[PDB]
Design a protein around this ligand. Structure first.
Ligand SMILES: [Mg+2]
Ligand SMILES: [Mg+2]
Ligand SMILES: [Mg+2]
Ligand SMILES: [Mg+2]
Ligand SMILES: [Mg+2]
Ligand SMILES: [Mg+2]
Ligand SMILES: [Mg+2]
Ligand SMILES: [Mg+2]
Lengths: 385, 385, 385, 385
């Protein structure tokens, strides 16, 4: 189960680089040089890396210092063959963003948030990124009167419309992906799920430039079914990127390595991504637990990739099993893919077999055979077939 | 705090009519005649009632029996002045719907679900309803292989498109509202939140005919902020109807009377509905607990209305308080309503006060004053002002 | 992975016998004769069955009817070799129990609850049960003023003390197990977790007669770690019985077949039960989904047993792997089992290596190696070793 | 609603002193001198303050530096009349505690945790504290194999037994209180609820020295009813201390000011504490949101006290209302306080009115009148009576 760069596995600098500070504890690991992270991830078989502006260039850097941080980074990419497919903006760490970036109540903060973002879009294009992610982690409230949500959505639309006007006028080939999260670090965060983000995009001036970047753990922080939400994003044609990790239920954002947390949900996610032909990066947004030293960091990163490849094998074996194919027919998944009324409305109204002469008790008695199908799926996952 | 029919309070027949059967227990109350419910609700000050087809006309009724059930019901409305502003379809109780109505795997069940719905749309128009609600309580799954969600969303779109073609061709003045719920009675339900429903509507052939009917308790079953979701529905212009009740956190659907459960969330909800000028029905989808006899049923229904009117008074007093108006300015809610960059993109890029000469430390030091504002809101809610 | 009666797998009559009624739907399956359930479970390889009084003898039965229901049941046990290791009382379905049994506000209901329980204890002993389970599903409240919880705990202690006096005076060899659940069907249920039940038992007059009967899904309805709670019950010497099923997070009680829901939690549960030498019944309290016909009922029951046996194999292979044994030493699980200060308090206070000369930075730098250990556990679960 | 020191309101140094660092953001406020916090809290009407060792004496301090930090602190207490009723140990911030203090896998860390605790017990007694709190925030795991929970509970019992031997041998008048929390910062924390802590205490060598210190938000992080858990702690005689704050459901630990979050739960909590005659400190463990400057810190602290005093007034008015007293009788709260069978077991078995001649249908028809009682409680809370 060895990864190659053809598997398109990517990692954020901030993931293996997390020093282990949490709300109740200081750092347990020293800071990593981005150049060292690129080299070590390349040896594990990764395809590329991602960054926030402030991961790569320390906040407050002069233009000369900025030049040389980028230069060192580019040499490591050239020296390893690593790519940069996605970048994003840090609009959450600095105290100026304590009430938000794009939807801060103070207007001068909102303008500064836009200028900080635009500067990093230029850098992202220079490094070859095709997707630009926005996670509005500070957009929200802890109390009800602090934020008029209709005015805040006006300001959020204004910001994303201006970013779309900028990339159009510059002739850039980059698209935007909005990353939803329901809460943490704000009491409630605006656009809290995949659904809310998809609905918001349809109100932007150029909806074709915007999609979603869902995260496993974030939808599970609201108790939702992550493969179901991904399926709705694919159905809408909006799955531009994806963040993979693990989460144990409704609690703080754990960011466990992928495959930990809800294992069966990870199986059904890989089944869906591979069956639908998703061709974007398989990005890991995770934190090696602060119990670990650096050997444990690289073991945890390797585990992300290994677990994806094991689940891919088991999902492919499940769908290729003739006995599974007949079970799917037994449960009428073939009929679910057929139109309800391709004959049209008038024919449906005139069809007495659809109502007047429909035998409801005979139809109700038909078992769905879902439990036998699910145990076949369980046997394949566990390698008991 | 006495309600009048001008307050537009409405109740479902199935609410005060719930006999008290739950998953572990038999009924504790006898069945109510719909005519008796109309009379008793009118004396409490309600504006109108709502129904599923199967609440009004017992399943399997002949056409003659159907005539006389409707006739009796219409006489009670004439005898009381009660209105019928909303109706909906029961596509969840009968065993034939055990895998769904519009997205059942069996195609013949899907056609029957459509015909059962269309028959009740005709009746709803006859009785004067302006909104037709769809709650797809059986659309979903308990296991991952049972339901291909992309095919299911194709079938859900096909059904709603056909219903829109029917109402257009008949010349009906009625609109549709989709009611989301995250789970129960299925393990996961399709379109689980307000956001997912709003995004789905934008893919229908005639999006102007469809809005949402959110329920307090349903969004709280996913831990979400209900006033925030309502604000996004209002921002999109899609709040066609609303279901009011109470819920104590993430657990089974409690359907407590409105004002029970999360009291502060109810306060901020009433503040939002009244400030935005929502003019639709204030509908209660609740269940009097099965501990109660019939005197307790009517006390619980009266409590729904009383709590709305108390919160309306306290929310209006909060917004009219000069000291609250100055606190809102102190927290810069006025600046949140102002455009970020009405000067346009080029001016923003050329504005050195937005980046090169922006003092981030001076801006970060400004307190938001949110806690004083929230304690003023708490004092108003409790009548300590 | 074929079960034999030596595996001690047991099932409640109410599990495979569930007709499929849920809060929003009527039954989808006909009622099963208890005699037929005993025969079919014996052919699947079960060890025995369990019952509530009202599963076996319909409520309101005459003494003659009661005789003949028991006689038929005993003949099926003799004809199959099936055992009855546990029984319990139905104090939740009948409307008289709408505010509780042992803690109902009405005193005459509490006395009736005790007499109904005592009558079934006699029958349980006659049939050879060694454990008597109490699930107080109606003991609780939906609102704060309805139930003074200190008075309710007085009444709960009084009831269990009287049941202990009865079994002592009769000379019965049976023990009691309290089954906790946090909510549903009451808004909150008294003694909501394993911990609350264990603490309550220590206040009874004869604590040695009482233990717990925890259920997988019930502790997960509060977001808790089920193997952790079982470990505390074993540590206290109070795990008298256990209920196995599956649950997908914090929501209504799903009662999925064992192994569904949180698969990794099921793995760590089987590891713990087998390592600690638990020798009681492996009881399944589950509901075949109402989508299924009777063939699906027996497939779901068979799946319960199969999944336990697969996880048992993988857990045993994990603990027997020499590379896992060295990883456990690398993470210092051996040191966790060693006393902190067998040298005593005075020696600890005099030990300068424990404080004055302890190198905290050298100790803090030691990685725990937990992630490599957990990936070895994941590889064993999936059969990638 | 002005507090006086007779109201026994207390605050931790770490509460108003929180600088605003969260997992995604740097500090927004400068550090407070403990002397300044004592002075400002005294002017607001507080009774006293609490501390962790590391709040008062920076980690790594020399014995001379330690002397002078304590001396300055004692002068501020003398200069204000403020008391110190509780103290506790920081066993969670330093990296050495990344796998726990008392249950760390490394034995040398466990010994150091005990010595760090004992040193602060001496200081607490010197300052007059009557309660010593233990919050084992790092005791737990993120993965299943990292922690054998039975060995960990052995080590936890060993630590608390040694602390009890120390205070006994020194002749100290101080008692211990264990503070439970279900998760955060570990994936699962040992002793996760009030119930688990109460059960654990009964296994210690000297159970009379140990009680619980429950926190509002912590029990709500598991979806539990906080007044119910407090009632069980009072029933067991173990409520030695209490932590008051607010929490909005199941998510990260918010530590909102008291009265925010679940307002009705706060009302029923104050009703219970005042009715049972709880005479310990009313301690606030809260964090002023990082949106606030120092004026907002003191406004948030003042709000904690104000909300307690408003709820106390409304709860007292509720219990003193003659119409509420008759509603309580209507719902048979008087009968719940009466013994079920003071006549004893034999009389109960011989009482035909308890079973053979009990009219179950007449009893089942009696309404409980809980909804009218709860609306009277709602009217009193809102000041609509
Ligand atoms: Mg995350
Ligand atoms: Mg992410
Ligand atoms: Mg509901
Ligand atoms: Mg509803
Ligand atoms: Mg259950
Ligand atoms: Mg059970
Ligand atoms: Mg807390
Ligand atoms: Mg605390």
């Amino acid at each position: 189960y060895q990864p190659t760069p053809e598997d398109r596995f990517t990692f954020g600098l901030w993931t293996v680089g997390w020093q282990g500070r949490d709300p109740f504890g200081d750092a347990t690991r020293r800071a990593l040089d981005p150049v060292e992270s690129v080299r070590r991830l390349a040896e594990l078989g990764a395809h590329g890396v991602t960054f926030h502006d402030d991961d790569l260039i320390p906040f407050g850097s002069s233009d000369s210092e900025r030049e040389e941080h980028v230069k060192r980074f580019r040499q490591a990419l050239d020296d390893t063959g690593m790519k940069v497919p996605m970048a994003t903006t840090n609009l959450f760490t600095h105290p100026v963003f304590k009430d938000g970036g794009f939807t801060a109540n103070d207007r001068d903060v909102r303008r500064y948030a836009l200028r900080k973002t635009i500067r990093n879009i230029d850098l992202a294009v220079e490094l070859g990124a095709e997707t630009y992610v926005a996670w509005g982690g500070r957009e929200g409230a802890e109390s009800g009167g602090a934020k008029d949500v209709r005015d805040a959505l006006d300001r959020m639309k204004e910001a994303f419309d201006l970013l779309g006007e900028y990339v159009t006028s510059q002739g850039y080939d980059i698209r935007f992906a909005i990353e939803p999260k329901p809460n943490e670090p704000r009491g409630d965060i605006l656009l809290p799920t995949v659904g809310h983000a998809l609905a918001f995009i349809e109100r932007l001036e150029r909806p074709e430039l915007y999609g979603v970047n869902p995260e496993v753990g974030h939808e599970q922080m609201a108790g939702l079914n992550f493969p179901h939400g991904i399926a709705q994003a694919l159905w809408a044609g909006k799955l531009f990127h994806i963040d993979l990790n693990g989460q144990n239920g409704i609690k703080y954002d754990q960011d466990l390595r992928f495959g930990a947390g809800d294992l069966r949900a990870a199986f059904w996610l890989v089944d869906l991504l591979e069956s639908a032909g998703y061709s974007g990066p398989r990005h890991f947004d995770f934190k090696p637990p602060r119990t670990e030293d650096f050997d444990g960091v690289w073991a945890s990163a390797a585990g992300c990739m290994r677990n994806y490849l094991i689940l891919k094998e088991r999902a492919a074996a499940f769908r290729a099993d003739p006995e599974v194919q007949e079970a799917l027919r037994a449960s009428r998944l073939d009929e679910l893919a057929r139109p309800t009324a391709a004959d049209g409305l008038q024919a449906l109204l005139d069809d007495r077999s659809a109502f007047e002469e429909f035998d409801v008790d005979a139809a109700a008695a038909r078992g769905m055979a879902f439990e036998r199908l699910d145990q076949l799926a369980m046997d394949h996952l566990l390698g008991a077939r």
